[PDB]
Amino acid sequence: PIVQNLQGQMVHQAISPRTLNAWVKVVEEKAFSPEVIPMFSALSEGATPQDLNTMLNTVGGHQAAMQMLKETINEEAAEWDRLHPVHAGPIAPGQMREPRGSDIAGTTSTLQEQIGWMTHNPPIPVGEIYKRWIILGLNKIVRMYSPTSILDIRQGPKEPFRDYVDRFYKTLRAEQASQEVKNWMTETLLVQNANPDCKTILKALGPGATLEEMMTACQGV
Amino acid sequence: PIVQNLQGQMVHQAISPRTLNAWVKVVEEKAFSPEVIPMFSALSEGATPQDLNTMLNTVGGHQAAMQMLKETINEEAAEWDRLHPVHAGPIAPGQMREPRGSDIAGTTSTLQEQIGWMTHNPPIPVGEIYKRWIILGLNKIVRMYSPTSILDIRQGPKEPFRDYVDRFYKTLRAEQASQEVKNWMTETLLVQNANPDCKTILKALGPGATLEEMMTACQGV
Amino acid sequence: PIVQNLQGQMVHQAISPRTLNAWVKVVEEKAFSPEVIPMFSALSEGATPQDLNTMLNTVGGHQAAMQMLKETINEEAAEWDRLHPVHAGPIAPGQMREPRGSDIAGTTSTLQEQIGWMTHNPPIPVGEIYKRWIILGLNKIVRMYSPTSILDIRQGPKEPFRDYVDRFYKTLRAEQASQEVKNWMTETLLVQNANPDCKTILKALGPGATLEEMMTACQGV
Amino acid sequence: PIVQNLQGQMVHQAISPRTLNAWVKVVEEKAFSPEVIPMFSALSEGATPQDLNTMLNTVGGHQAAMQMLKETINEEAAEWDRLHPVHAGPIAPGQMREPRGSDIAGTTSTLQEQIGWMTHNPPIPVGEIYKRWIILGLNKIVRMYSPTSILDIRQGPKEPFRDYVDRFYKTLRAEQASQEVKNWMTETLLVQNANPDCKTILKALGPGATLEEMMTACQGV
Amino acid sequence: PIVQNLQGQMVHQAISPRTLNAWVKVVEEKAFSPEVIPMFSALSEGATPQDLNTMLNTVGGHQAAMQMLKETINEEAAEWDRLHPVHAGPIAPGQMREPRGSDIAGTTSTLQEQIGWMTHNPPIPVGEIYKRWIILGLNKIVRMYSPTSILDIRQGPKEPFRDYVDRFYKTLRAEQASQEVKNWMTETLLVQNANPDCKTILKALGPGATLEEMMTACQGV
Amino acid sequence: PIVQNLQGQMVHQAISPRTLNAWVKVVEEKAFSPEVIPMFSALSEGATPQDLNTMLNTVGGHQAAMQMLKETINEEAAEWDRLHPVHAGPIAPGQMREPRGSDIAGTTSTLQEQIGWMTHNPPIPVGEIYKRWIILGLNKIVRMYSPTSILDIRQGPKEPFRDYVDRFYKTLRAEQASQEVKNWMTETLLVQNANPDCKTILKALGPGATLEEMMTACQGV
């Protein structure tokens, strides 16, 4: 990791044992559940591509998903190469060179160049660029490892609205979808896939009713 | 979070693994229980909107409450905009741009922006403004996910007074009701819904008796 | 709390995740057991009233004890308020005000006021004042939830004197009773409530024996 | 280990209890599963050769595997002495001695030579050379201690492709096979050792298919 | 406790949670066992009298000993007052008041006074003095609470010399005897009080043999 | 212990809780195992004799070993005094006193003296010296509490070769014998003490076969 102290004093730190353990245990316990993404992202704030590779490589099992993640990363490295030409210019001997895809993915750069890119002026955020590429592949993994389709999420006849809504927003959370489309699934599907009895109730509230009002309206139906 | 050092030197740091796990296990273990709000608020001291959002996004499950909270937050951000019109013409180069409700909520603002208002003299403490909106949305949730009103809490045949007075001020603690109404519930219901045996003993003290007189009188029944 | 660093800089620090966990486990493992009150005093070393209410409020359940505690704090506050003369008109900017009972209890004051009082020499130690009120209320509660009278503790037919002494000064520690009454209990009851055999041993030493002499005599019975 | 602090400041410190313990417990619990080698690299960031011997000598249990690794360490050591002969006379003015194989392996050399080599400019990275020699012998242990070869990974009749693919990308992970060769093993063996139903669907995709296209095709199978 | 930084700055810091918690755990796991007195002393590095009292009060149960310990501390406090009485007239303007036993016992002395004595020119280490007084009483607990004497350990017909010697030196640790008396007990009781089969062997090695030599001798009897 | 900071500022530090807990746990799990001995050095890197006395004295039980160790140290101590006699006539004015053997074992030397010798230039390493005596004595203990002869380690009629090479080198590790003789045990005894079926397997490879070759050859017999 690299920890910035007062005055922007940037110092690399080797990775902590209790980070290593927390992150590995999270993936053993909860698998590819959506909270893994914010947890991953948090626990790798200021990480180098080597520290990020550590976190993935210290995981055993789930090797079908990690093989997909490698490929996804290899695709984002071919796309960084496509977008940023490979030509070495009249750059100074002591100044940082220009990162490649494989520099970003942590394979052709050294730790000192990765610390260098991050700390240097101008900086290149090779650690966070790589995080976006991992997180994308994780979006593919979460989406792939979902057991449920969001359209089949429906209120039962004897199902409290509130337990259905937990089901609706779990299965929705685990979709990759535009926000606009997710807005549409809330405003169309929630009232639409309800039970007749509760369906009536949410309609009487009209279109400016809140989920709070909606849960409290269906408290005893 | 942002650690205030000596000479008033404020340096940001990312949120700890053991804060993340203590907050995560709290929600798993204790659900929407009243002490969860001071516990959340306490583990979130010195938090930015990004750190508060981290803590909420690392909560896996309970998504009907997180959606109810999203709508609540949006209502407090939008309400902030209601109070404050858009600031016309050019922004001054010595001055920070004044936050909109969506900058406070952490979404049309960067992390660096959040740190910018909060640290820049005279500080705008957007973390502690937004935090109060979160603690607002949580109270609504704590109060909703409560199964019992005070009328529904009574002492059974052989139940010790002590466990009942605990049940009573736990359910009162979690109610929506005002202090004049929560006084009325205390002075009426508490002795009224005691069992025959304990009710007889509390009647023999008089009505002017204290909770201390009430606890040491009715203990062995 | 407020951590004093070098050359007497007292600077506030948030209550640590492990402070919180420690108080949660202490209350979990040992409830309303005597030595828990020292754990609290220790965990509240250099604490503010916000940090005292945070610790009390972070307690799961036990609202009969906490409602009793509120009643005691509110009584201690009304008594402080009673004794201190009322301020004539507003407080001029150079006048650091003198706290009312509710200022001490953290309900009418700001954190900056609580810090202000403590650091502005001759210090008004509002944390340490409020802690005595809380500790005082914890002793009443503790004494009141204490199961067994000191009078009723007695030796088994061939029970070891040492184990009987452990029970006697364990129960004695939870007794309301005066130091002078407890000195009588030492001189009268300790031999008195022993069993026929050990009683005889103990009687033969006369009253000049210390507890080591009582212990070494009853080393074999 | 040796901690690089602000501005090339290298400072010696002891190997951490909870480091040491983390390594003993990974080996106690999990032996020589593929994830153990990345864990060992994760836990030894900035370790000297001495610190690296500390970690091998603190293993109890499994001394045939540890023996295999010493022999490997002597092989890797002898090869370093073959490639670079002894350097005659007394050491060059203000220059560090070129280490032997036994110096990299931490036996003929002293900890102060090891700290000089690592911290000097140009640095001699003795810690990372020996660490490769250890990682090579841990791979011989991993591979030997494995019961299944990648030729032997095959799908059940009613088995999910995904769980099988997890056994395959785990087994592929422990292969000493080169990357051009691992690529043949992916495009050939995965479908070939598939069940007849999932095999048919995957053959229909053509030879252009990704792992994702293969997993989403055999989702219903 | 009081933490010394560079330039001889001694600044008090509040008692650590995990120090507190570890102490508590020691008394529960090992009771008042011999090895506890060096662990306690170890855990009470830089302790004030108030931190020493905090450790004693943070224990519950085992109160016959806690009573022995109280009385012993009072005796020693009474001894310091006898050895060091009050000197004529009021206190110096710039210096501290000379300590009483009750000030060393931390009961009549404020924390500030206690900081005062350790930091003062000339300093009285009232912590380290009080701790020795505590340790005298702890040794009285160890010696009283040992179940058996060094005289009472002799070797059975199927007992291994090794286990016999384990028992001998265990029991010795807890006795009152001096090193020249303890020396006599090694050279006299151990072989004397051994079983016939090991005794012939040990006599044969002759009285200049070590315990390692005696232990190897008696290894297959 | 003594922590060497940047630019070589050596300041003594209090004996860390997880130093104390780590050594306690280590002894509880691994007793007289050979692995205790590197762990002992690693956990004592940077120690004083006071601190080494703390770890040894905080060991409960094992009092046969503590007497054997004690004896080994007094022997090493007696000898250090024989070889290093104190200088003729009057003392150098500024200098520190001569460490005697008991000083080095921390018996007769205070904390300050031990800190002087270690930090003084040229340093007298009382800590590292005491550790070799402690390690010498620990190696005797380990070896004593090991019982099996290496001649007695043989393969069962259908025992896995690995479980026998593990037993063989576990017992070999605790043998006293020179390295060339341990090389002789490797070449003679290993293949010799194997069962008819595995013996046959190894005999077919020819006698030049490496342990990697012996282990893959007997992978399944």
Numbering used by the authors:
A (entry chain R), B (entry chain S), C (entry chain Q), D (entry chain P), E (entry chain O), F (entry chain N): 1 to 221
From the study:
Gag is one of the principal polyproteins of HIV-1 and its constituent domains are (from N-terminus to C-terminus): matrix (MA), capsid (CA), spacer peptide 1 (SP1), nucleocapsid (NC), spacer peptide 2 (SP2), and p6. In the mature virion, the CA forms the genome protecting protein shell, which contains ~216 CA hexamers and 12 pentamers in a fullerene type arrangement. The CA protein monomer is divided into an N-terminal domain (NTD) and a C-terminal domain (CTD), connected by a flexible linker. A highly conserved sequence in the CA protein, the major homology region (MHR), plays a critical role in assembly, maturation, and infectivity.
Purified CA(A92E)–SP1 protein assembles well into helical tubes under conditions identical to those used previously for CA(A92E), adopting a wide range of helical symmetries. The CA(A92E) mutant was used since less bundling of tubes is present, resulting in higher resolution cryo-EM data than for the wild-type (WT) CA, in addition to attenuating the CypA-binding loop dynamics. Among these, the tubes of the most abundant helical symmetry (−8, 14) were selected for three-dimensional (3D) reconstruction, using the iterative real-space helical reconstruction method (see Zhang et al. for information regarding helical symmetry). The cryo-EM structure of the CA(A92E)–SP1 tubular assembly was determined from 33 tubes at 8 Å resolution, with a gold standard fourier shell correlation (FSC) of 0.143. All α-helices in the resulting density map were well-resolved, which permitted accurate MDFF fitting of three neighboring CA hexamers and analysis of the interactions at the dimer and trimer interfaces. In both CA(A92E) and CA(A92E)–SP1 tubular assemblies, the atomic models of the CA–NTDs superimpose well (Cα RMSD = 1.2 Å), and the CA–CTD dimer interfaces are also similar in both structures (Cα RMSD = 1.6 Å). In contrast, the trimer interface in the CA(A92E)–SP1 assembly (between gold, magenta, and blue monomers) is less compact than in the CA(A92E) assembly (green) similar to the trimer interface observed in the CA–SP1–NC structure. In addition, the linker between the NTD and CTD is conformationally less variable in CA(A92E)–SP1 than in CA(A92E) (Cα RMSD = 0.8 and 2.1 Å for CA monomers in a CA(A92E)–SP1 hexamer and a CA(A92E) hexamer, respectively). This suggests that SP1 limits the conformational space available for positioning the CTD. For the SP1 peptide itself, no detectable electron density was present, indicating that SP1 is likely conformationally or dynamically disordered and does not form a stable, unique helical structure in the tubes.
